[PDB]
Amino acid sequence: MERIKELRDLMSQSRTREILTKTTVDHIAIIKKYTSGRQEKNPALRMKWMMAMKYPITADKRIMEMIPERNEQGQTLWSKVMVSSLAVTWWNRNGPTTSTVHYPKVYKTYFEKVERLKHGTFGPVHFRNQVKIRRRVDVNPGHADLSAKEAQDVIMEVVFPNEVGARILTLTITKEKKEELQDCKIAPLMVAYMLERELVRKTRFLPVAGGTSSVYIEVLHLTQGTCWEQMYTPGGEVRNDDVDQSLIIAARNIVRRATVSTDPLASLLEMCHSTQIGGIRMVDILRQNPTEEQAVDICKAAMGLRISSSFSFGGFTFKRTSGSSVKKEEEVLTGNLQTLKIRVHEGYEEFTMVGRRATAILRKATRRLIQLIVSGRDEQSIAEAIIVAMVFSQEDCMIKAVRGDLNFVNRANQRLNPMHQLLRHFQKDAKVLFQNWGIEPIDNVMGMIGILPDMTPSTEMSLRGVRVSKMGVDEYSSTERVVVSIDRFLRVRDQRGNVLLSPEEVSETQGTERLTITYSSSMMWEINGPESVLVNTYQWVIRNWETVKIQWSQDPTMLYNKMEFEPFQSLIPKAARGQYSGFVRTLFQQMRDVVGTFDTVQIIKLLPFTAAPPEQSRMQFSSLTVNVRGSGMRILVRGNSPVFNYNKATKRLTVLGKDAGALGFLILGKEDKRYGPALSINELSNLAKGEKANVLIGQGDVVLVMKRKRDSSILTDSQTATKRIRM
Amino acid sequence: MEDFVRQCFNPMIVELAEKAMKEYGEDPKIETNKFAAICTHLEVCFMYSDFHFIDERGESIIVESGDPNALLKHRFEIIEGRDRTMAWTVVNSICNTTGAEKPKFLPDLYDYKENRFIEIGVTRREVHIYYLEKANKIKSEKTHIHIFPFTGEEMATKADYTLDEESRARIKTRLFTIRQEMASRGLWDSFRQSERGEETIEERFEITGTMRRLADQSLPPNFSSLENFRAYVDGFEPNGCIEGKLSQMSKEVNARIEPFLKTTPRPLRLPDGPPCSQRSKFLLMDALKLSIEDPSHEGEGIPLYDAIKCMKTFFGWKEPNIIKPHEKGINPNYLLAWKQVLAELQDIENEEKIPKKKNMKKTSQLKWALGENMAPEKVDFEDCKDVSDLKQYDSDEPEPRSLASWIQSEFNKACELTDSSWIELDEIGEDVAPIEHIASMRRNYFTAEVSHCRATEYIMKGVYINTALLNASCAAMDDFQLIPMISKCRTKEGRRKTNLYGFIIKGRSHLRNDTDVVNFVSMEFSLTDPRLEPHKWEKYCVLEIGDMLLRTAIGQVSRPMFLYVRTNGTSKIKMKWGMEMRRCLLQSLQQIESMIEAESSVKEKDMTKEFFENKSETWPIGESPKGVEEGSIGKVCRTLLAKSVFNSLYASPQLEGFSAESRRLLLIVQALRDNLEPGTFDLGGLYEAIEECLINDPWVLLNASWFNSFLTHALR
Amino acid sequence: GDNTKWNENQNPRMFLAMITYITRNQPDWFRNVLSIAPIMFSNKMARLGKG
Amino acid sequence: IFENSCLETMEVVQQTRVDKLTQGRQTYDWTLNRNQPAATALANTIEVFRSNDLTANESGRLIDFLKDVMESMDKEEMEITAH
Amino acid sequence: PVGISSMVEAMVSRARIDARIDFESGRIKKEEFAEIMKICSTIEELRRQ
């Protein structure tokens, strides 16, 4: 009754009854912001005056049995609930000491920084006119790169389970939190607030002077200054700088693999829906991770997500700064008697190109290059940048610099458009263009030095329009979110028909996995270990064994022809293959003949060999061979084998040590008084055998609830639509 | 909504929405609510269709997995997910096969077991109204209607909910979760659109009368209605009228660049007339200390009884001898107030109890000194009609007070060093190798070079006086109080010494607002004879108050003591600008620290310690004997400190305007010194603005003479 | 440079024009909403207060 | 590029409730004909609108408050309660 | 927060569930419970008009 009487006597005044009736819960945030907003009368002066006065503090009434009226010197610190400041310090010395000192498990977000400063070895202060790099980085260090909503839902669950949101789907972070601090609650609202501070990402735009991670940013005020800088290494690493790398590499290799597929779009889609990264699905990561990279942007585009309007080329991402584009198709002659029709962009344009290791600014008229200002780290970086720039110049000067025939194809031997052909021809050798470009005398102004064809800096001469910048060109990651129209060939045309992204600038140095990733959709296993191919093939058999149970009975030829065995078929030697196929198929025929006398374990043991075109050769077999990493391993046909070892009582299937398989609620309508009164979100006794219950949801109404029978998955049931539609 | 829609749905329904919108060319970018409603309807129909087959007998069943193992009839045929004409074709085919009369309206699903037409409706409003609307529009035919809201309710025909409970409840659950998700993103915008039956419209914002009447009245003077204006702007000719407008405009309307050479700058003009008086709130150098060396532990050392001993420490309080009057007004009231001050200073121990503060009596001479009795009539105009002296208040703009020579001498004495420390610069943690050592060797050297500066004493003086005034004005809200002008310092031998400069009497403090004016009277001690320079003290009245001992190398000199008294006003904000005067330190250090970085920006190893530690480095700061006088660092440090100090205490809008207009001229001269051939636009106009911001502030006038001598010595 | 007495010269109707051109062939009610403020400033009264 | 900016603006006018009227400096209330803080003028305006039938702001979306403003200009008599 | 229902329709139900849970296994007197629920029913009867 402690609370409701204020509501009742509040419902007494009609002008309050009306507002308590009309405005709904969804609008409570819109109403708490209705305050007089006048008690902002110099908080410094009011605080000083109230500190001069005795008893400015409001305590509870339970201080009587906890602290005394007279201190150890007879000082007055009570009233008749007001309390003076000295009580705090007295209680600060001697009171109920408590072992709640386990505090540094909810405040870890701070003590992480403390530890980073502990072993945070320093360096010298080399003063310099530090140039501001207009970059965009995160603010919270080590937060697993999670978005605000998908994190605050877990927060609301862990701190207020009796009013959780309607998201009930069935990440163990819930378990870890509910276990480590179950009865050791501290300060509810502050606990949830600080957890939101610890886990929720937020990334925005700042000028930095070389700081990459978040740890190099929380200590920015030490590092960066007007004309100084201090190198400080906190001795550590976070997730946000090395979690997205794994998705980057996985999407890059996925695109590298998708070209050979007939329809790369569909194979890529099945991959992305199946592939798991760090225990989290890749599709959700694409929907929630704001990382910009060709492979990731294309995978996001396949699911219809907006990206930046980029003219990506030469490994360099482009951004529209000014100017218009006109098609103006045109003829071109090569240096080896060859005609080429190419899309010479008409009109004036002015762009800023960002690269992996360099940046540059460019102005461009109709086949005119002007004011190319580049800044990079390595000689090779500025070399590549100047090369792709002169390729983009479209002048006849670079047209003359063509040497040799132009035949550069996809990994699937597919003719590439001319621009990429020129790029790949020059990337290995392009020294001939500078000597035939033209030189201009410069004036050594504003710390902008020139570059020569021999990759040598020079004082008073340079290329036409070229400028070497110091310590980086001004980046700008413009914010655009525009729709795109990808084709069946992994080409990107947003709205204008301009080639945006293409699987010709996707690869760099070897990929080194940090996060453990797993593919599960299509072949996509020729890269992973051969043992991984075996265990993955058998696990996939165990996964969809339910449909094989009858798909092995009727039209088994198609099941044998399942292309998910194509990676597995290339492992078994190409010599004794068809004989094995014929033997296993006649064995299944024998089992079909003498029914009942057949073991399912041996069926799984000998099934995956069918993918071969059989050859009814006159011999049988009891042992089958597989070549993995040079060495050949055998599998028998009766009982367990070193690869196929199925324990008798365990019922779990083992393949090379690796284990392999074994053999919320819904809304029914509004509140109805049939199934008793309302409940909270706790069914430890109600989850017996399927009950009915009316229960409050979140901060909303009462909803009815029954059990589930289906699973409501994201699988091909959505794709089954394309068989009832477009029949 | 749009991006969320692309988040919480499959791309196949996206393509279906594309196809259904192309049926009427419905652009998604506008009909975003229609986008959401259509994707909703499609997924609703689908999750109604999934796992619904018909057994061999006359009933329907469900399946767990998806496979056409001799069974394909979906118990329901989908209608909406197909194109317009093809869907009508399918409807005609199934109607002719079953002989059921087709309805003119396009359904969304067809039943096989019941052989009935089920159409599905998803809306936001009350479900009763939607069911009744669909019935009043579609009636007299056996056509089953099924409506699902987002809340989760469910209404069928004749309680024949044409399904099991759970397979439908999953649909209600998806609806409810989608609603929660669009709510957390604050995307309930689609509430008022489905409140039309026609579920596509957006927020219509018409412009009816009393509003359009101003809109069509808001157009340039060649149009009648704003609709014609919108059409005229939409259909526009970017033809290049700019060239013609230029050809029409006169050649006189132009920014004719006028040059700026080193012979162009003229020295600034200066006002002529009466010498500049002093309006400073308190004394700069003339005030005298009452050295006590009393370490009372500052246990909130009561400022009044810390002052009674200052009074007890002087002997030779002569009869009050009026020397310099206000030059206008009844002066004897000042000395009467002074003797009353002494009386109330000696009438304390007789009230049986010591009061922590003495409320001066509401005396007539003091009432005149504070002008509390000086009040006009507050009379409404409707009463005081046709009055002879009803003319307006004068409100005349002030007279130009010419420059005098004393402000420079006061500034000179302001930059000197004393034997007291005046500061408690708080401790700092250990300093790590890279910068903390550098930040230390900057701030601590600056401290030791400015710690003992007299400008520190000035700042602390303003702080304590205004602090006590406000802290009493809160609690002295109705009666007079006494205000001791206390300062504190530390001896060269290191003993906490308390100084007293004078006394101040406060008027009424009925301070409702911040700009509320409170009058006050100040009496400051001095050994500076007003008979020396009289025009300086126009607002001041002086009293020969006695004689004090002044020890020298050979005995004492016995110079006279004087009391300077003035009347002024202040307010709450006036005081708080002065309780924070320590800011003048930071502004100093940073305008030092700025030069430590900019002029040292060009170095691999920054020039920081070599800024100090080299006395051979000299700074031109003075020219008395027609010659440039070079000085060392600390003099410059205290100089900039005193600059910000005086600018803070003498804060006047004329100083603001002069600083603004001097920045421009100084920047131009600095550019010319670098030989970068600058120019101007309206040089006479700039001089005009400068002269317009120069009337009476003596601090401004000294800065002006400084500027003129600088341009003369700018080698220009 | 600066522009003396800049702020007293900007006529709300020019803002109406630039907003309208920004809303070229855009939906009607959007033009109606973003055109409110300049039209209101076309007929705007300055308060004195006390005197 | 203006249509991109207009799309962000349409997103804004779709999600923006009335709260963004409060985060700001002092305002002018005609109810008392004086400068007052944000929520003061907002609450007085809402309550004088509720004094009449004009109640669209109860939806919470700011555009409905704008429709309320328009309908208020459309009405001739506006009873001002004094307290 | 996220919720369509009215303020009272949420607060009354929450109060009833709270009374239930801290009566059954919690700590409350049955008469205080009955008075709480009667007051809640009074609120309901007042919100119906």
Side-chain angles (χ1 to χ4, degrees), chain A residues 427-440:
Chain A
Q427 273 192 237
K428 246 200 170 294
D429 187 6
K431 309 166 189 174
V432 317
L433 184 45
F434 297 118
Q435 312 281 339
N436 213 280
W437 176 272
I439 309 300
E440 55 182 0

Side-chain angles (χ1 to χ4, degrees), chain A residues 444-575:
Chain A
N444 294 260
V445 296
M446 318 225 76
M448 318 302 295
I449 58 179
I451 179 62
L452 299 192
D454 68 330
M455 306 316 293
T456 300
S458 177
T459 55
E460 62 265 356
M461 286 186 194
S462 79
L463 308 177
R464 165 170 47 91
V466 76
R467 288 297 182 273
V468 183
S469 170
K470 206 173 77 170
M471 202 90 224
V473 155
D474 319 319
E475 281 83 8
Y476 179 59
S477 306
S478 185
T479 166
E480 286 88 350
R481 305 260 296 188
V482 313
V483 313
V484 293
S485 76
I486 188 135
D487 60 7
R488 226 196 82 184
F489 288 150
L490 300 191
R491 292 286 175 71
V492 180
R493 310 171 203 104
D494 45 6
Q495 192 182 352
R496 215 60 56 86
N498 40 12
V499 278
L500 313 182
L501 308 177
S502 72
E504 188 48 42
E505 42 182 9
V506 75
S507 180
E508 69 171 356
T509 58
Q510 317 166 46
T512 307
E513 293 178 299
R514 185 177 190 271
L515 277 304
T516 298
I517 63 183
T518 304
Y519 328 95
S520 162
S521 69
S522 89
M523 70 295 188
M524 202 35 208
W525 301 317
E526 191 90 359
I527 299 302
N528 198 334
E531 331 95 330
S532 299
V533 186
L534 274 74
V535 306
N536 193 312
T537 304
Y538 269 75
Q539 279 181 197
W540 193 93
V541 168
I542 307 168
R543 190 182 316 177
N544 293 96
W545 149 264
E546 214 64 43
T547 173
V548 172
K549 180 178 183 178
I550 44 87
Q551 203 165 354
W552 179 79
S553 312
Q554 307 186 15
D555 54 284
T557 64
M558 319 287 299
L559 171 140
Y560 305 155
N561 287 118
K562 262 287 193 175
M563 305 312 175
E564 279 74 357
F565 295 177
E566 293 293 333
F568 175 45
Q569 188 195 155
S570 66
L571 260 57
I572 165 170
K574 312 192 172 184

Side-chain angles (χ1 to χ4, degrees), chain D residues 6-66:
Chain D
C6 284
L7 252 59
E8 287 192 352
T9 303
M10 284 210 315
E11 194 180 324
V12 165
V13 310
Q14 277 195 336
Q15 293 95 220
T16 297
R17 297 285 188 174
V18 201
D19 289 338
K20 267 285 189 178
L21 204 59
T22 72
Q23 298 183 9
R25 218 146 299 181
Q26 267 257 349
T27 66
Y28 175 106
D29 185 0
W30 49 272
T31 315
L32 303 183
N33 192 2
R34 200 191 306 171
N35 303 20
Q36 284 294 276
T40 293
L42 201 149
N44 292 326
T45 318
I46 287 196
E47 195 63 30
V48 72
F49 282 165
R50 188 211 166 279
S51 306
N52 327 322
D53 187 276
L54 304 94
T55 46
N57 50 312
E58 297 183 316
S59 56
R61 47 207 301 100
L62 176 54
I63 171 61
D64 284 18
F65 175 78
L66 314 183

Side-chain angles (χ1 to χ4, degrees), chain B residues 301-409:
Chain B
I302 169 76
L304 206 163
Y305 311 148
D306 293 5
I308 55 100
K309 33 196 61 180
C310 320
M311 289 317 218
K312 278 181 169 61
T313 42
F314 177 65
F315 317 115
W317 313 74
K318 200 187 305 182
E319 260 272 327
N321 185 20
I322 167 174
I323 316 174
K324 159 70 177 52
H326 203 339
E327 290 195 19
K328 266 307 177 301
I330 293 183
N331 305 273
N333 277 340
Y334 302 120
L335 49 93
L336 256 70
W338 174 250
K339 276 205 179 185
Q340 174 174 350
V341 166
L342 292 177
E344 291 290 331
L345 275 176
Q346 301 315 309
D347 297 339
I348 328 174
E349 278 75 13
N350 314 357
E351 280 188 46
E352 205 170 313
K353 279 181 173 186
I354 323 188
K356 308 165 178 289
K357 53 179 181 63
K358 195 40 167 71
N359 304 17
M360 291 300 189
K361 293 194 65 177
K362 289 82 173 297
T363 48
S364 302
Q365 331 91 343
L366 221 44
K367 282 184 178 180
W368 173 90
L370 299 171
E372 187 169 348
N373 186 29
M374 211 82 248
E377 304 190 51
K378 173 207 175 186
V379 283
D380 310 332
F381 197 98
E382 60 187 6
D383 275 353
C384 52
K385 208 68 174 296
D386 309 9
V387 192
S388 304
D389 69 322
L390 209 50
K391 293 184 64 67
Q392 197 209 5
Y393 191 91
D394 295 13
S395 305
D396 304 331
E397 297 308 301
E399 53 182 83
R401 299 194 183 105
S402 61
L403 169 136
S405 313
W406 53 269
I407 187 61
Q408 182 164 227
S409 299

Side-chain angles (χ1 to χ4, degrees), chain B residues 13 27 56 126 154 456 512 542 564 580 645 686-687:
Chain B
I13 291 191
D27 199 315
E56 300 113 39
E126 209 95 40
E154 157 197 14
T456 326
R512 287 177 287 101
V542 200
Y564 288 106
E580 300 170 351
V645 168
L686 190 54
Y687 275 13

Side-chain angles (χ1 to χ4, degrees), chain B residues 627-677:
Chain B
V628 168
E629 282 295 328
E630 327 182 328
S632 72
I633 327 288
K635 287 96 176 173
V636 175
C637 312
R638 298 175 287 275
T639 310
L640 308 167
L641 177 60
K643 181 180 190 307
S644 182
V645 168
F646 269 79
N647 294 316
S648 176
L649 184 47
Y650 273 113
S652 314
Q654 298 190 45
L655 169 60
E656 159 190 306
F658 182 95
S659 288
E661 306 323 278
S662 57
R663 222 183 293 102
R664 269 67 148 159
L665 180 46
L666 173 64
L667 277 168
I668 294 179
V669 177
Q670 181 50 62
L672 193 277
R673 292 210 303 106
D674 310 329
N675 205 332
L676 307 183
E677 49 200 55

